[model samples]
Target: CSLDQTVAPGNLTLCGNATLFTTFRPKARFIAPEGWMNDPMGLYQRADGSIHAGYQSHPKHIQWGNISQGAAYSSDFTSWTDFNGSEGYKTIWPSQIYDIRGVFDGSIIKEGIDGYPTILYTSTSFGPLGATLNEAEGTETQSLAYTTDDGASWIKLGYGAGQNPVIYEWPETNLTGFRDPYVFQSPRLEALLANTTSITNATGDHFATISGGVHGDGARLFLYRQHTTGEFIKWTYLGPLVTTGYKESYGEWSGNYGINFETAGVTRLNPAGAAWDNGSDTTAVDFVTFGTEQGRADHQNHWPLWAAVDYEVRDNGSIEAVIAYSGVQDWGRSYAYASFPVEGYRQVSVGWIYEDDDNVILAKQFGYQGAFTLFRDLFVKVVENVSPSTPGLFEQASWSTKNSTDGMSVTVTTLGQRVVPETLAAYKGNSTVSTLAPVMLNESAAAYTPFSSQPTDRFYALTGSFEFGLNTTAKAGFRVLASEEEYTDIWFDPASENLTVVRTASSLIKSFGNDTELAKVKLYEIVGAESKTLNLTVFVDGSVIEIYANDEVALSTRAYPWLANSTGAGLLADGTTAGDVVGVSGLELWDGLVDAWPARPANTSQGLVWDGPTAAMYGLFAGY
Candidate 1:
């Protein structure tokens, strides 16, 4: 009856929802730990406080995802401590000459005038372009590994000086599309940075004729500085942080470019107000900007500015810069949203929309609803810009909390698909409005009536409800799939529910239905109940389940971690022992920010009334 009953005296909540909340929680992602993942890579916040993460790992279903090198440690990003195989270069575990085909964009240098605390990475073994349809068969170029032991172990630093174009390709274009390597050192300006991705303009400076990165092979950042003779020159071209725009040539399985570079993990953060004497202080840009004859501009040869090694001082004098580099991929699963802040020229970002435009009017009338299937992990300490309205994406106004007081108020709203003007006026028999989609409840028959009694490991606020067909516009793929078969796995509560279903094997089972009704919402195991305590929180919105079980309330659907594409859920006792479900104890999500209401009560924490007195107070407070 006690695993977190209260902690709002200052504010660091983990989960709470019952009527319109989903943002990915139950986190321990302290920064990716459990295998086969990409980017977010290294994000530091240390000095003594501690919070370092270096990622890249191999051996998953036998190197199917390949590429290795993973390290994690945190003090308050929410528990994560993995030395990979023993921490860095200790290798061995489905090994083959190091990382066996993977390692990406890493950095951690709390100080290095010899002051100590250093760790840099970018491995990705072997390459001759052996098989390229977008890089595969031994993809190479991306070196420089070091570790002063904070992460425990690692080495490999001198194979990055370029031997036969070790990795600079992008001149005439197409050098396997380069790799992800984001290193940094900036003791204010002493300099030692590296921001990867190339097609070669070969350090001719100022980014030779820039045609928007990666098509010229996009995204760049290399500026060595420190050649008195100790050796560290020949790497100059600090422009073009993200190019090949209009969705950067479609990579990473596809959605909006990212997560498909083998890995591009980098970190940076100096925002406490940031005016800095060093790390430049511009604002920064490079999430994805390329379409210039001089128009959508901001690639400004990359370094819009951020490279300040360690600074964290805040009782109020305010300063928090462990910032080496940052860009957390959003656009569902891996592309744009929450983690961006390259700040120097102007890249001040914030996006986590769960659903808006009213879930697109419920997916254009129920071809199926839109966004936030569950996977939430929010951090809204500062959110502004009312610039007439609209900026980089995700907007639902009403803000508060500039410096923790914990009254908590902020109400966004989004979950789209649209087209229900009376179901398009009864399918145009009466005429007037238009299209819609996003609604199909987990393999029919009202699917467990939307839960309250069948869910034995509890947590709920799931939803979904459709009708689309006024001349649909296409693109309706609502995913939450996973199968070992057992009713199609389901369990998500990511802070509020922005899409989550995690439980990677040991008798796994998952599915919440999407990809246009391939339908599923399974999860079973009652044979002695495995020790009983089935955690739950399913809020699918597009099929309708405003809230369920212990949070109580729906007609359809619902990670904390189910990586591989992630999946696994339980519940299937159609009377007479259905079978399976041993252990899958954690997962959290809330991809839906505001799909027109109905789902808020994991404990409830809403309110943004346009933020005046610092908002923070919506209603309902029970659990922690």
Candidate 2:
């Protein structure tokens, strides 16, 4: 379909057009496909160069009682093949226990003491835990399990350690908060680490490395070690992984965990500009680069080390430990539960800022957790040679987040006033364009045109100036929304500075429908030259027009005396639009959070868009 006939033109329009975004790009890769897939489990890089991922899954169209362990192997992160439903991939027979109830966190190791690839996971089965919410009253417990043949089958290991409600509390917390077990070897304090959680605590959990013996919910990960003397040591407390946000608000569908990373070395890095000491350098960010700042903000991307798990011994006879942790789960995903990558010692790292759908001003991504629609990945960089006084209205500030509609925003704050400014954009690629900057010929009226033909593919870049009397504090700025949908003044002041900039586009399904003013204008401000601040005001009644400096805001005790032309004359000030603009940039608004690492969206186990009837029975395992 040449890509054009495949997806909808306004990709955001999902209501009317089904299959609107079926085939998107990052053309070379695929992610956790449309069905249910949760936290990367059994995340391993095999010796034979195959990368394997184990995760929690429920039916592709989940109801209840249909959660299972899922396995997939990939040569690269982009491609994946399922290891479920096949003959040799599972235990519990075709109809018996095939991930029907709930399966917990697990890991893959070479057939220890046995042989072959073994998958060890936690499972909540028959007994008190198995009595489905209805059968067993409200109280349910948890357990652990394992598989022997390359993830083809399974078996339970003894009983779960926490079966007796050893960590239970009432009223204050819910019991569902506990589950998902991450089991891994930690090098730093040299121990095997297992992190689990419950619903409530008698007192609040301690922050930073909660040791001693915190037995209930929000249990910070504790470490247990096998000593050289062949003795088993108690699980010691390291500290809390995160301080704010939901620490334990997840179902089988969506989960939340935190990580703390220290810039241990050059290998780990916080996002650029995150620690900018100079206030001036952080004045404004480029809207594009502002999008990718999420994942890179807290944790530095050290070369991945999935192979370190197989290392034999260090030169000093000590097992060289790694700086990361993993967990397991029953349904959906999240490595071990909030699996964090540890940097050097004592430092847990996080991904950079990720742009979400609502905030980004210019562009967007294809689907949630899908590959970026386009390759315009803006890493952290700076604006060069551009100054606050640079003859045009440019972006001075920006912000973005994930999942939420407030994906991105930018401020066009600075203004300059010029005499006769050449409209470079009016003659973009003309060979015989004027060499001299044109002077302001007319100041009252400005030009406007709609993008013809491929109106959807057209965008414009505009530049202009604004002139303030001498010492003016009438802070003014321009605000734009995606797809040129709506625009109005960013009212820094609403009273004394009574100005407005209404959306003028006229296309219904395109931007905003036509002749149909997206909105009416109560005030409008345009720019000209390079350095002029034109502050305009509309007085309604009992006051004369007055211009002054040093006033933080326009403060006039005027009343509505001029009633005849109230609506029209109340906000009409000629001084604002009396000039022209000089420069502008063509920008396209795509969906997705601007940063790679804002907050994750609410899990969609309950309500998700899907294709056809699901045969995979693991769908409802998570949120839905």
TM-score, each model?
A: 0.26, 0.35
Candidate 1 lDDT over 150-219, as tens digits, reads 6465445443334212233443244334444444433333222222223322222111111112323433
lDDT of each: 0.27, 0.25
Residue-level error in angstroms, candidate 1, position 417: 32
Per-residue lDDT tens digits for candidate 2, residues 1-624, read: 122422333434333211322322111221233233333444444556555555444333222234455555554332356564553232332132322346544444333213344333333434334101222212222233434544445554333243221121221232222233333332222221212121111111111111111213322222222221111111222323222122332211112232211111111112232221212334322110000001111211111101001112333222222312211111100011222222112111111111111222212122322221111111222222222333211311111111213423222211111110111221133212212232231243223211111111112121222333322333333232213232222222222433333323211223211121010111122223234333322111111111111111121111111111111110111223334222211211111211111122222122233433453443432242
The reply for model 2, stretches above 4 Å from the true place, is: 1-34, 62-65, 84-100, 109-120, 125-148, 155-176, 191-219, 222-624
lDDT measured at residue 580 in model 2 versus the true structure, 0 to 100: 28
